[PDB]
Design a protein around this motif. Structure first.
Motif, short mmCIF file in Angstrom:
data_model
loop_
_atom_site.label_atom_id
_atom_site.label_comp_id
_atom_site.label_asym_id
_atom_site.label_seq_id
_atom_site.Cartn_x
_atom_site.Cartn_y
_atom_site.Cartn_z
N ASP A 40 -4.10 -4.54 -1.95
CA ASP A 40 -3.28 -5.63 -1.46
C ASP A 40 -2.66 -6.42 -2.60
O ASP A 40 -1.80 -7.28 -2.36
CB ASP A 40 -4.10 -6.54 -0.54
N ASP A 41 -3.04 -6.13 -3.85
CA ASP A 41 -2.43 -6.81 -4.98
C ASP A 41 -1.41 -6.00 -5.77
O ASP A 41 -0.62 -6.62 -6.49
CB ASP A 41 -3.51 -7.32 -5.95
N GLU A 75 0.89 -4.01 -4.32
CA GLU A 75 2.06 -3.95 -3.45
C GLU A 75 2.60 -5.32 -3.07
O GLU A 75 3.73 -5.40 -2.56
CB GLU A 75 1.72 -3.17 -2.17
N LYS A 76 1.84 -6.38 -3.28
CA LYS A 76 2.27 -7.73 -2.93
C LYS A 76 3.36 -8.22 -3.88
O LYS A 76 4.48 -8.52 -3.45
CB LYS A 76 1.09 -8.69 -2.95
#
Ligand SMILES: Nc1ncnc2c1ncn2[C@@H]1O[C@H](COP(=O)(O)OP(=O)(O)OP(=O)(O)O)[C@@H](O)[C@H]1O
Ligand SMILES: Nc1ncnc2c1ncn2[C@@H]1O[C@H](COP(=O)(O)OP(=O)(O)OP(=O)(O)O)[C@@H](O)[C@H]1O
Ligand SMILES: [Zn+2]
Lengths: 468, 179, 469
Positions: free
Chosen positions: A464-465, A467-468
């Motif tokens: 989740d980090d 691609e954020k």
């Protein structure tokens, strides 16, 4: 065919001959001479014959409607698994009745037995039958025990033909040769070590009489569920005093030595009578031992005595043959001992069948799946594949069905909820962190499962980090 | 090492963990003990008096950013000393044939080969294997990028030994492999 | 009296508390000889809500142990003793049992009497023996020492009973003032619990032919003897049910207590016929003789405790919530591992205010109780259980608390697994040996085993690493 089956060094073959000369096989030539010859050869060289239970069938003995269970013929161990009240001891009791009727032929204690009592019939029906089959060197010898209620006698009738022939074979063999081995009909229950003691043993009936040590009395008090320690003490006193055949005591001692790790130098005490053993250079008495040690002591002593009495003038007394039934073989044993009790027995008492009942998985990840029977709802279900060398948790969850982690506990429900939170979209939620801290503070920060959960949390943080 | 102890690299909630024993509950088995607890047990059992322990104990941070002293027996998860890089280095000034004994005593005194720690760091091998199941060189590159990032995390010594003793990971780090 | 602490103690004593009233009772007795009587009256009157527990024991030469100073917890009512066959579990329970006999002789049963350390109970090659037990009640530590010295050494220890005498004095004072008062249940259960659960020839034998008095006292008779009086329970059951024409609610609270342990039993009804007790098992009515040993044991163990608790509790709404030092031995006996995971929690939920000091040879009973309440006896020494034995897999408990391997240690299919692992993690992966043993193990354990699939993952990675190189 008739010429081919004629054998000079085999009785298993020379029993079908006895059945041919006669009737009921093919309606062939009857005579009274060749029948005599092939019945004389039927019991004359029975060396290496293992008496075994082939199959059983029940009708309504206690709680069952029908059950056809076949026992092993290659592996010498069978384990019955089930819940409390799932009819494990019922099978043992049916086989016990069958063995009581098998006895009194070669025991010669009359020809009585043990019928099905009224309280043993299934609640609300009018018939029951314990159909038992056997095998001694190939040939099958059947049994049927019948019990009816008046008005319904046309449903079952007792036969006892197979044992009536098998006892004839053994009695003929003994009448020919007095030095012939005999099978063991031992039976043990949860009341096994209820007599192990030496209190008032001088005035007891055991050490009061001139007990006759022979090959037919070894079946006395065998199908009762108790190991007579006092009669063993009487035997030991004679074997230790008459010395002033020394292998009789040595062989018996060097099996209890194997089952007991650190016991040596059994010796009689001619002071107030008691048996003295050495536990790591410390002399101890029987009363000063523990319950499990006394249980194994009595069991092994009982088998050793009842099998050295049955095999006179042999070189290896503890081979023999027999059908030994043991209820709760895990009784009063530490799981270290409940992991080698069975292989040790099969190394010491090799040619003996053991139909045992267990309540622990430690004695179960030592036996193949094909030799384990699970009883559930009055029906037989075979064990899953891969039990001989399996982890105890797998055996517990697949053969002793129980959650490996307590279904009702503050730390199992919490663990499952924490896993549900982790493997979701709220892995980083405050609730998940709180439950993770709570489980870590109790199971330790370094538990096998929590490491995996933390690893997955780190992976999902990274995913989740980037691609954020 | 804000949330990490020196001897075993577990995540705490010189900081040292509880060593498998909450607070100071006594009569504990001297086999589940690691770090400070087993060190104190060793001190009591072998009657050692000098409690400095500096000179015979080497911990990962004080070492010159090197972890080659330690191997990783993947069958059990034990951290074991290496003949190479220990017979070729001296610490604080000593013969080069004593660094091996320093490492061996450090492993023995701290008891970093507890069954708990072995079965714990054994799972990192499983997690690194699961990434190399689909045989995708991008996910494995990503695994190395996260495992060789700053702020050393839980078990950041085996996390480096595993990358050390690999051919795809080392080759991808070098440049002979381009994904 | 100094108006600093005596006044502070009397302030709480007048409010009502056994400990507060007793605090000044020993202080007063310049002696006054009347304040002691007043404090004794107040204390004996204020024994409501008490709970009797054993605090600590200490052995010197009692059967193998040469020194042992264990203590028991007070925040939880279950302490399990775990060890190898023959280390210390039964010896410790017997040591506690001797003290419970010496206390039962002074609470209710008759007067000063008890049992001492026999010669066979003294460790070989020694000359003295001692069993020191310290009791606790409402927060007061009553000591007790039992001693036994061989001739020529009558100077090492003297048997002192200076706590049990006073505890019995307080209880007799309470009983004299108020006939209706609870008393601490004292029970001992051995491996011989279920040897007399049989309703055969009950009318002919004793407990039916003899008139029995169900006083509050005499409920301690044959309690520290092992066997459970199921036949006296049958008499109790008959002199109730037949007295239905109390006698209803007592059986209600005993029946719903026995039914909580047996999942599918109901309708406990007497039979006026050749006498026997009839239960129902899923719409099938059957007798106690027709039950199972595993169920007969759990019937006889808890019915007896319920009967004793009802006898010791005169008119309480819930008679099964008193105080007790029950010492069930081998609680895992004749129980399937599915009942072995509820035997302890069910006992604590039903018999709430009862202390159990039990012995266990099965991890299934163990992994439901915290480490702080489990004692391990390895060589001659007490070792506390490792962290995390509540909510853990049975195999972890087996390895780390029983020192028994998860897999068998001498099996052919378990010694092949380690050789397969060694070959897999060495440079001989994907060799003919590494495939022969792999195929054998896959056939035995199926192609879904948790360890084998991980080894397959490792060999897959190594094949990848040597193909792309
Ligand atoms: N005559 C009968 N009529 C109806 N049900 C009966 C009858 N006899 C026995 N049963 C039922 O069958 C069960 C008896 O089986 P058994 O005592 O052999 O259980 P077990 O599993 O071998 O013992 P354990 O609980 O120690 O493992 C009892 O639960 C009882 O309910
Ligand atoms: N008077 C004595 N002198 C020396 N040693 C003794 C003496 N009495 C007992 N022992 C030793 O201490 C042990 C007592 O066993 P105990 O029953 O107390 O432990 P246990 O854990 O309950 O064993 P188990 O569960 O198998 O019954 C014995 O194994 C014996 O070796
Ligand atoms: Zn640490």
């Amino acid at each position: 065919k008739l010429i081919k089956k004629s054998e000079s060094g085999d009785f298993a073959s020379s029993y079908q001959l006895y059945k041919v000369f006669g009737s009921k096989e093919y309606g062939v030539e009857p005579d009274e001479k060749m029948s005599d010859y092939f019945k004389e050869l039927s019991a004359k060289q029975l060396e290496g014959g293992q008496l075994r239970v082939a199959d059983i069938h029940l009708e309504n003995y206690k709680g069952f409607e029908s059950l056809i269970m076949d026992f092993s013929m290659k592996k010498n161990s069978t384990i019955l698994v089930g819940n409390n009240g799932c009819g494990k001891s019922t099978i043992l009791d049916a086989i016990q009745k069958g063995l009581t009727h098998l006895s009194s032929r070669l025991s010669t204690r009359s020809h009585n037995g043990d019928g099905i009592e009224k309280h043993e019939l299934r609640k609300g029906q009018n018939y029951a039958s314990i159909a038992i089959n056997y095998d001694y060197m190939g040939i099958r010898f059947p049994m049927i025990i019948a019990t009816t209620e008046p008005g319904y006698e046309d449903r079952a009738k007792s036969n006892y033909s197979g044992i009536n022939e098998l006892g004839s074979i053994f009695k003929t063999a003994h009448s020919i040769n007095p030095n012939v081995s005999f099978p063991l009909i031992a039976m043990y229950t949860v009341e096994r070590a209820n007599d192990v003691s030496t209190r008032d043993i001088e005035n007891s009936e055991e050490i009061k009489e001139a007990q006759i040590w022979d090959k037919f009395k070894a079946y006395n008090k065998s199908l009762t569920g108790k190991a007579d320690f006092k009669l063993f003490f009487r035997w030991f006193k004679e074997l230790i005093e008459i010395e002033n055949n020394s292998k009789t005591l040595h062989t018996v001692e060097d099996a209890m030595y194997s089952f007991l790790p650190g016991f040596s130098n059994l010796k009689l005490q001619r002071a107030p009578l008691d048996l003295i053993v050495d536990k790591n250079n410390v002399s101890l008495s029987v009363l000063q031992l523990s319950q499990g040690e006394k249980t194994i002591l009595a069991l092994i002593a009982d088998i050793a005595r009842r099998l050295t009495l049955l095999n006179p003038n042999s070189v290896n007394p503890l081979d023999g043959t027999g059908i030994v039934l043991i209820a709760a073989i895990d009784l009063h044993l530490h799981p270290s001992w409940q992991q080698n009790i069975i292989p040790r027995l099969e190394k010491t008492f090799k040619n003996i069948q053991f139909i045992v009942t267990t309540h622990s998985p430690q004695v179960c990840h030592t036996i193949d799946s094909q030799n384990i029977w699970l009883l559930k709802n009055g029906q037989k279900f075979k064990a899953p594949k891969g039990v001989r060398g399996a982890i105890s948790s797998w055996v517990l969850e697949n053969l002793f069905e129980v959650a490996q982690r307590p279904p009702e506990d503050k730390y199992t429900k919490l663990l499952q909820e924490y896993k549900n939170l982790v493997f979701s979209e709220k892995y980083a939620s405050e609730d998940a962190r709180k439950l993770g801290a709570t489980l870590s503070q109790h199971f330790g920060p370094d538990d096998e499962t929590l490491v995996e959960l933390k690893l997955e949390i780190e992976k999902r943080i990274w995913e989740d980090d980037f691609e954020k | 090492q804000m949330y990490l102890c020196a001897y075993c690299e577990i995540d705490l909630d010189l900081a040292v963990c509880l060593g498998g024993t909450n607070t100071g509950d006594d009569f504990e088995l001297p086999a589940n003990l690691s770090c400070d607890s087993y060190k104190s047990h060793y001190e009591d059992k072998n009657k050692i008096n000098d409690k400095d322990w500096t000179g015979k104990i080497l911990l990962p941070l004080t070492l010159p950013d090197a972890h080659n002293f330690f191997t990783f027996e993947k069958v059990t998860g034990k951290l074991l000393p290496n003949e190479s890089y220990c017979n070729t280095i001296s610490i604080d000034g000593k013969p080069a044939a004593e660094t091996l004994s320093i490492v061996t005593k450090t492993i023995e005194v701290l008891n970093l080969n507890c069954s708990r720690l072995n079965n714990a760091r054994r799972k990192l091998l499983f997690h690194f294997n699961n990434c190399a199941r689909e045989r995708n060189l991008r996910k494995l590159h990503n695994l190395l990028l996260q495992w060789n990032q700053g702020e050393p995390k839980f078990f950041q010594t085996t996390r480096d030994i595993i990358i050390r003793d690999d051919r795809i990971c080392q080759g991808l780090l070098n440049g002979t492999i381009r994904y």
